[PDB]
Structure 1
Amino acid sequence: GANKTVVVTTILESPYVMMKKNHEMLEGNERYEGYCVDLAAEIAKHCGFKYKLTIVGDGKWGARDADTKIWNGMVGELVYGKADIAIAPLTITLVREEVIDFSKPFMSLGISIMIKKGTPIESAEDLSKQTEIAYGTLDSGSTKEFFRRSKIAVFDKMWTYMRSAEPSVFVRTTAEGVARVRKSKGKYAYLLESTMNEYIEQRKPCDTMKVGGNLDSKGYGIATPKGSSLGNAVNLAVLKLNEQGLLDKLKNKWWYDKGECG
């Protein structure tokens, strides 16, 4: 039948999607700003469709409950037909790839370590060997799953450490993880995706730092319901945007062009 406005599901997480300071004076998609907001506009332009940016109701990303087997977050909204496409820093993982379609990566990243400047830690191995400096991750998401399911000695030990550490080394949000690193006087290292780490390292008060190399290598992908008709075009749009150097420009814009740390 007739074309329909594409429902885009995303989530508020800086600097990917944020409500403009003057959002109360704007409307529709114009209320938001950020890397993903810009990416969505570019994808829509190339694929030639109108869209509406919506915020995922449950505020989750994409995990399936072991008991009920129900998918939450943006993945769930695609799986159950609540949204047509998800545009956010959604990590491409096996479990998600099995239920929805992912475009090729629009951003490359890996799990990294965030420390307050001055902390005597240079790698994950360094962390695994001690307990004075506590370390944890988000209480849900791809990074936590990485450690939970890892069979690699170092990461396996880090996981066992994390589950038994007191007080809890887990945080509910990125802002919480960042704030804990900053207020813990060097006694807390935060494991998060390099992208977020690199972003925070350029924000005042400039007291955090990304150390060591990434623990893994992966990417963020645009997701659509399995078999969806938009899948193909969106995937080609992603590759096109990357080849035109558009994606690198968007990262620079939201990560470095306005860096606040020199």
Structure 2
Amino acid sequence: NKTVVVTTILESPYVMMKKNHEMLEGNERYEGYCVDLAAEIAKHCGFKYKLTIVGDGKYGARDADTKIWNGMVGELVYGKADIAIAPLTITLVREEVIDFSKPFMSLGISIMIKKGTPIESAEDLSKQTEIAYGTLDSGSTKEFFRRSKIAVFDKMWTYMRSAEPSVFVRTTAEGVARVRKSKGKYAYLLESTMNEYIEQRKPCDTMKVGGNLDSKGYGIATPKGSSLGNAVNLAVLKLNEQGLLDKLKNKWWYDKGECG
């Protein structure tokens, strides 16, 4: 057997650099939900692995011109990594080029506001212009709006794509910082999982409002045809049935929440 190369992404609380990572090496440098999940998956599948952070820091999109896949999806497609264990959304376009395990976490697009912002829904956002709003500049959330045929979401996309200055951000942390520093004049559309995590982090000035706009899941990905796919899929189901996934979410989201 050969050491399995795992690609993942620095996104809290899935994968984060330990405070004393400098005095550590290898897999011990990282911590988080996906770090713990990788260990469990490897144990149940019987393989040794090496955690690596995706080179370009992206999730995975295909350039329409070059037809090249970037991010974690690209690392799997081109053979740079053997498996991706991260908050990677299971989508049709990705499923066509890589394999996904059954979902290990459920989520949906949601709204994050600075406390006090007079917004309760996506409809509210679409009907006004005072408060700007956007999404991560790349990823399944942005694609949801770009492709949506639903009236409200179509209206939101039409506004966001031409908004000036840009309402799109490079990372979740940037979106959160923008919400926190815009005095309620910026609302952020992001995956509910990240939203829920941030709501329990100091300075406790943000909140998730309304229901989710959609429902989907994160899955563990492997190059299509990979001999690891079957075992990884069964391991995810086993971990869910044993309640381990629920335990891990509580560990990284709520057990040490900072907002009471």
Alignment of structure 1 residues 36-47 onto 2, 5 Å? 36-47=34-45
How much does 1:138 deviate? 1.0
* In 2: Cα distance, 1:13 partner to 1:201 partner: 15
- Give RMSD over aligned pairs: 0.6
Aligned to 2:111, what secondary structure does the other structure show? strand
Question: Which of 88, 101, 104 pairs up with 1:103?
Answer: 101
Aligned to 1:157, what secondary structure does the other structure show? helix
Aligned to 1:145, what secondary structure does the other structure show? helix
How much does 1:235 deviate? 0.2
* In 2: Cα distance, 1:54 partner to 1:203 partner: 26
* In 2: Cα distance, 1:231 partner to 1:168 partner: 39
How much does 1:168 deviate? 1.3
Alignment of structure 1 residues 81-120 onto 2, 5 Å? 81-120=79-118
Aligned residue-pair number:
260
Once the two structures are aligned, what percentage of the paired residues are identical? Answer: 100
Superposed CA deviations along residues 41-95 of structure 1, whole A, max 9, x for unmatched, are 0000000110000111111111000001011011011101111100000000111
How much does 1:165 deviate? 1.6
Aligned to 1:190, what secondary structure does the other structure show? strand
* In 1: Cα distance, 2:168 partner to 2:25 partner: 36
How much does 1:13 deviate? 1.0
How much does 1:5 deviate? 0.5
Q: Which residue is 1:168 aligned to?
A: 166
Give ranges in structure 2 of 5+ residues lacking alignment.
none
Q: Which residue is 1:126 aligned to?
A: 124
* In 2: Cα distance, 1:112 partner to 1:13 partner: 17
* In 1: Cα distance, 2:191 partner to 2:25 partner: 32
* In 1: Cα distance, 2:162 partner to 2:226 partner: 43
How much does 1:241 deviate? 0.3
How much does 1:113 deviate? 0.1
* In 2: Cα distance, 1:186 partner to 1:23 partner: 36
How much does 1:141 deviate? 0.7
Aligned to 1:120, what secondary structure does the other structure show? coil
* In 1: Cα distance, 2:55 partner to 2:171 partner: 16
* In 1: Cα distance, 2:221 partner to 2:257 partner: 30
How much does 1:169 deviate? 1.0
Aligned to 2:152, what secondary structure does the other structure show? helix
Give ranges in structure 1 of 5+ residues lacking alignment.
none
* In 1: Cα distance, 2:54 partner to 2:14 partner: 14
Q: Which residue is 2:134 aligned to?
A: 136
Q: Hey, which bits of structure 1, 4+ residues long, moved more than 2 A?
A: none
Superposed CA deviations along residues 175-222 of structure 1, whole A, max 9, x for unmatched, are 000000000111111000000000000000000000000000000000
* In 1: Cα distance, 2:79 partner to 2:36 partner: 24
* In 1: Cα distance, 2:163 partner to 2:81 partner: 39
* In 1: Cα distance, 2:159 partner to 2:58 partner: 26
Aligned to 2:67, what secondary structure does the other structure show? coil
How much does 1:26 deviate? 1.1
How much does 1:22 deviate? 0.5
Aligned to 2:145, what secondary structure does the other structure show? helix
Superposed CA deviations along residues 82-120 of structure 1, whole A, max 9, x for unmatched, are 111000000001110100000000000000000000011
How much does 1:139 deviate? 1.0
How much does 1:249 deviate? 0.5
* In 1: Cα distance, 2:109 partner to 2:223 partner: 27
Aligned to 1:40, what secondary structure does the other structure show? helix
How much does 1:18 deviate? 0.9
* In 2: Cα distance, 1:163 partner to 1:68 partner: 22
* In 2: Cα distance, 1:169 partner to 1:131 partner: 13
